[PDB]
Design a protein around this ligand. Structure first.
Ligand code: FMN
Ligand code: FMN
Lengths: 145, 145
């Protein structure tokens, strides 16, 4: 099977989680392409992948701001081919702020409204990722695809 | 059975939806308590209710914000006794915005992480509330009590 990981990341945190997910998936025979969301467009993006993992950090002062590179994909996510596609959502944040990983909830709800199959409960990284939590999430995705 | 309807509303729209839902529930034999979230504190809020309906509009000048009175309830929602509780989420918004009722997305996701049972898909109200849409949702809730 093939996986796509698309991430929005300002300081590299969510990018590092994407890369760590991909290293496991690739090691377990699921060919995985990791791309900055800034470099993709929505139409047909999920077609041809058996699973798509969406990563996005949360920013904004006293608000949920999606990491800015992700917003155009969120706006047009209805064109990506997610109906009955396996999806998982992840992202970095920090529980000292108001809406801890709120972008992850916003993106996961839209995926669900668009008919995606959510492979696992979302991965919400508080601060610096722990390799155990990232690895177990990658194993859920593998088990479900 | 007893229903709690807790709402955050700045211009009265989600308040008016709360009242319309309550009319339905009360006409179908529930004892409904309606409260503005500005007047409550989180600890133990849900205790003794058969179903809890959480209503909140979407604000924020630039991005997603919960209606301001709801924010402290959301932040301390873990104290509200939602584990194994039947919950429904509703809210007003405007689909001209990027994040249409994004406060509903965020509250719904948190309620499920806290172990609540969602009794119905969440109700997202676009602009002026439609009485048929509200009534259909209230009847979905009543059938799960
Ligand atoms: C001004 C500002 C606002 C933030 N707001 C949030 C927030 O609302 N929720 C959250 O969980 N984390 C919040 N964060 C934490 C960032 O998501 C966190 O630093 C994350 O590691 C960034 O990931 P990235 O490098 O992939 O962009 C905020 C950080 C800053 C500096
Ligand atoms: C400044 C401002 C920001 C808003 N932002 C959003 C938004 O991000 N998403 C949305 O769906 N609706 C948004 N709305 C629409 C309000 O949610 C809508 O007017 C609603 O009826 C208010 O309900 P309330 O009277 O219960 O507070 C915004 C409205 C205003 C005035």
């Amino acid at each position: 099977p093939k996986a796509l990981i698309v991430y929005g990341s300002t300081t590299g945190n969510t990018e590092g989680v994407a890369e760590a997910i991909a290293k496991t998936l690739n090691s377990e025979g699921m060919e995985t392409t990791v791309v900055n969301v800034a470099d993709v467009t929505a139409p047909g993006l999920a077609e041809g992948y058996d699973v798509v993992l969406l990563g996005c950090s949360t920013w904004g002062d006293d608000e949920i701001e999606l990491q800015e590179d992700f917003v155009p994909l969120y706006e047009d996510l209805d064109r990506a081919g997610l109906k009955d596609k396996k999806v998982g959502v992840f992202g970095c944040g920090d529980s000292s702020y108001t809406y801890f990983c709120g972008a992850v909830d916003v993106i996961e709800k839209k995926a669900e409204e668009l008919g995606a199959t959510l492979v696992a409960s979302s991965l919400k990284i508080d601060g610096e990722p722990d390799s155990a939590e990232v690895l177990d999430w990658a194993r859920e995705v593998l088990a479900r695809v």
